[PDB]
Amino acid sequence: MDVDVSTDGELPGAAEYAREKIGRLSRRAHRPVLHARVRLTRHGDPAVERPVIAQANLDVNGRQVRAQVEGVNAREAVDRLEARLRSRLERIAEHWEARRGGVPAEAGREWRHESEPARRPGYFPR
Amino acid sequence: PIQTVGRRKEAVVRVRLVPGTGQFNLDGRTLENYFPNKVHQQLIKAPLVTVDRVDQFDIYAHLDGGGPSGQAGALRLAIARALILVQPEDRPALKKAGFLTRDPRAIERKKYGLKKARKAPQYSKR
Amino acid sequence: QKIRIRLKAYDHEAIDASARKIVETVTRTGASVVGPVPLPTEKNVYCVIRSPHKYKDSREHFEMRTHKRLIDILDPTPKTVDALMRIDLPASVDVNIQ
Amino acid sequence: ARLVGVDLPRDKRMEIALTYIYGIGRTRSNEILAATGIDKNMRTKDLTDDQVTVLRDYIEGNLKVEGDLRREVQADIRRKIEIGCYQGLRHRRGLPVRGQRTKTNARTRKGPKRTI
Amino acid sequence: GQKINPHGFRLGITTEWKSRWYADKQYKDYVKEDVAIRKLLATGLERAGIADVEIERTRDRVRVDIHTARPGIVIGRRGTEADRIRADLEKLTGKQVQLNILEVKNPESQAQLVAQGVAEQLSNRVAFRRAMRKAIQSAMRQPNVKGIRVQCSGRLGGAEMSRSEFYREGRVPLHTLRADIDYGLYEAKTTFGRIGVKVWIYKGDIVG
Amino acid sequence: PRSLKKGPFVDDHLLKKVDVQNEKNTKQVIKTWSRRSTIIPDFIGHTFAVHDGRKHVPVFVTEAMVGHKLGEFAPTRTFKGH
Amino acid sequence: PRKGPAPKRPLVNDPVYGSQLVTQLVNKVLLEGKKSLAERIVYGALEQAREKTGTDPVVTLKRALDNVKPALEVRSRRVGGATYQVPVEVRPDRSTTLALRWLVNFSRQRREKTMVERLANEILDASNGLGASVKRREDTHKMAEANRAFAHY
Amino acid sequence: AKKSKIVKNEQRRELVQRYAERRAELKRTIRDPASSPERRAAAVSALQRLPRDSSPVRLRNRDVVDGRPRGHLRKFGLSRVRVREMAHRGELPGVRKASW
RNA sequence: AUGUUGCCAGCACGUUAUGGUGGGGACUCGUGAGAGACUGCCGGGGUCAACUCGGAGGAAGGUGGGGAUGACGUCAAGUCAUCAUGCCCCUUAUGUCCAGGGCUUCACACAUGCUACAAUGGCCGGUACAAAGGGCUGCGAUGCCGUGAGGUGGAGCGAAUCCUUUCAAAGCCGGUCUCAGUUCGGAUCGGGGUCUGCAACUCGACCCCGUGAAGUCGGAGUCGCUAGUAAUCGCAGAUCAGCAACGCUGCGG
RNA sequence: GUCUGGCUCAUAACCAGA
């Protein structure tokens, strides 16, 4: 996977670390990734306890996956962003293994929104 | 004499009706030198057809504003109004045909932020 | 000889008030009028961005509307003239005498 | 018909056939046809030999086309290159020379896109 | 950006322009001298509550009418204040500039004066709840006032966190066009920054 | 290019400089600062130190570059590649 | 369409043929609002058909429509969280719309050097039952029949 | 914007009225007719000797009070930010919000 | 109600040049006031209630169409570079003046658009219909000179009057091209010019001659739009000496 | 098996053709 990182100000080595960490997420995505962008920003105010902000955006075959984190330095922000992206990709999977427990089962046991409605005759059963 | 007006989306038509032959005088030009489109001619002569008074009224018309289609529509409304003024008791026939209704369809105002009246700029999620 | 009296004001009621008061005074002096002939309203439109920074898609529109009335008299007797330069009008309305 | 070494198109109107000459576009062909006197709508298979001759000597007379034009353009470009002017090294490295933007566009001078 | 300025919403319906003149070639310099006049009057007079400043022009003579809650403060008994304002308005290249000092009939029913008083109280030492409550009660005590809303925001009480607070009494129909809402905004100067106070006062409606 | 009626444009400074330069037939390096001046046939031998933004680059005029500007021969931006 | 059906536009009868369907055809072939060119193309095609066959163009055009009009069409249906190709009966209006759209498109991909000749040839071959629109109707009917197992829902 | 730059704009205007009024305009009248002998006259060179600030081409319409160099309106001499605020307060005669 | 700079139906003068001209409120039109849609009425459902369906009348029928108007708050969303401002920092400088350069750099990536890939078309000739808006050291006409940008010249206009041509293009008619990387497409490049500006090298626009690239309808994926809408065609304005405007804001076919 | 069209979030499987 190819990632372009648009940092700002002073963050030496943040671009390379973010690139190498994010590029490892291609195998986790179950569909081809069309685009992947990362942005690193730092808060000017020293009063901020977590100044560094990292944002990511992945185009998973038309499905947009994004996350945003805060950290005290570039490495921690990148690692937390990787964790959040992994969780989002896990929740997006949508392949059969990810939607086999949600497909309605049985015949009369259990009901879901998309469950097949029961067929009813014209006359009351009696 | 009698004189009515017809208006159709910025086209204004003044009509002067006299009981002569079926000669069509549109700003000194005939129905063929003007309006060289058969559909426009049929749209013009429809009120005469439904009233069956074809070729018994010399028509003098003043045309300004809009294009050929708007001019034709406003002219048709003008002959409808002139006919309703000449022979009142035909109002059912013209009205149920819709020829007595001014068409309130005008160019929608262009809106800021949109390329056209409703067309919106292309938006990219990725 | 007739002279043109031209009114231009941003407020309709103001220019109508001035027009009626002017026809009143010229009729007092005994002059023939034409009436306050209306003229097309002039519209100047401007579009501005609401926010100081960015946010181009949000715009605000303004206009300035100018109303015009035309007064023409006849038989310019000197009494009507002396009355004409002795008229007090709202500052909003101006007069053009030609 | 072989015109200044150029095989004319088989069936074309005269001026547009003459457009195929490297030194002639549409205006040049029109004015030379009008001045010399041949019809402008007649097809290329209707030329007689003397018509070919009159076109030939007129064109060699008051026009410059084909190899001489190409070599003159090449020499002009080379001379512009060798004096070290801005257009010089612009020609040297295959980039647009008339101030066109190069951040995104200018693939015509850059050639086909390459991936690095 | 939530609410448009109430004066501008009803500029052509209920409220009136504060400047009355006509110019075609000299619109630009008229505007320049008008804003110069307004800013000069703003900085010069701050004790007396300056509620409104009108400017009228007709050729050479310029007529400026201003409304204050304390006319005696801005006017000199021997004309000393009048002399100063007249001279420094001649200095504004206004040619003949002539003034009508006026006084407002109900100071507590005017939004600008209410905001000025609330901000002045806020500046020195007063807690904002006291100021808002006092202004609201004083305003509703007046006969024509049908509803008042008072709001100021900023570092209230010298705190590190900006806050927005507001109280309302009665009816404040901001969306109703015929309703006349007197709107007043004025900024409170505090040692911790700037506090902006907004006042809406609703007094019936005008039908033309 | 500049219209023909106005004629070529040359700054007065280096104009008087080259007139006093060629009056005694000796051509030393002339330090200049008007990159907008056209080349005139009076420059054929003179060597110009035309400005660049940082320094002055020597420009030795020839017959070929007459009619251009001193600016085309002092390339401003420096690019070596990525 | 969440709150109910929308009203239909009552387009007018043609002046020089007096039929609803030729107006529907000109609106189908219309591009960019150039209505005059669309009517010229349609009228030229109808006159070419009249010249070739020797009879009224409206009757042969109607014959082409009935030859290419579909009756059974397949739509994807999601019942009980599963999607299949379900054959569905087609209303008369939709069948006419599909037939006209097929005719216009498949005429646009012909090779008769001009839209008028392409359209005339397509209508003639549909009238005789050899056009590509007739073929397309054959395949859509074949697909509807081949999925008859899913017709119960 | 910056006080120095607000001032320098005005200084250009007084320079323009002092010089561009006749000095930087008669030279243009000399150069216009090809019949006029411009080449020996050095009306080009004489007009180069004039200060650059004489030229109105160096002027910039800034906001009359704010100093804002962009989003300017020639009718009012005011920035888009200031026009919006004063029109809303009813300060510019005969100006109001639009609808049509 | 209203007649000028706007209409001209009936009257007269017109000379090709036309409301052009004397005249006239008749019809438009311009701009003031007012009427008109209120489930007002009828029939049916309805708790005899809200509400709903259909019909009559009407220009318009059920908040007629489109605008302006954006509740308490959210996202420490944006803006200390419109402005103001607490605190901190600079003050022989982080202030201030000037010339030159840069913001236009390019192995690439993303995004918004324009032009195309053609015959529902290209080119040539003739020919018909708009709205809105702008104009004083500005719009600038007739005429003359260029092939064309344009040059000379200045009529009349603070403008319902004059100029933007009398205003358009798509459209209609006629001729030609004959399915080709072409009479498509116009990039790039060579030469020659015009205009603005003190000055078009970096780095303007336009004009002429020549040059004639990719491009054969575009993968995964994705966007806008329900009616005068999408699609398509042209016109105008702000900024502005000039323009990078194919952008933005409007207008009509 | 191999090339499409249909279908699927895509490969799959199923359907229509060469």
Numbering used by the authors:
A (entry chain w): 1 to 126
B (entry chain j): 25 to 150
C (entry chain k): 4 to 101
D (entry chain n): 2 to 117
E (entry chain d): 2 to 209
F (entry chain t): 2 to 83
G (entry chain h): 2 to 154
H (entry chain o): 2 to 101
In the authors' words:
A similar approach of multi-body refinement was applied to improve the quality of cryo- EM maps for classes 2 and 4 separately. At this cleft, the NTD makes extensive interactions with the 16S rRNA, anticodon stem loop of E- site tRNA, r-protein uS9, and also with the inter-subunit bridge B2a. The E- tRNA anticodon stem-loop interacts with the linker regions in both RafH and MPY hibernating 70S ribosome. The RafH and E- tRNA binding would obstruct the binding of RNase to its target sites, G779, C1365, and A1484.
Mycobacterium tuberculosis encounters hypoxia (low oxygen) as a major stress in the host macrophages, and upregulates the expression of RafH protein, which is crucial for its survival.
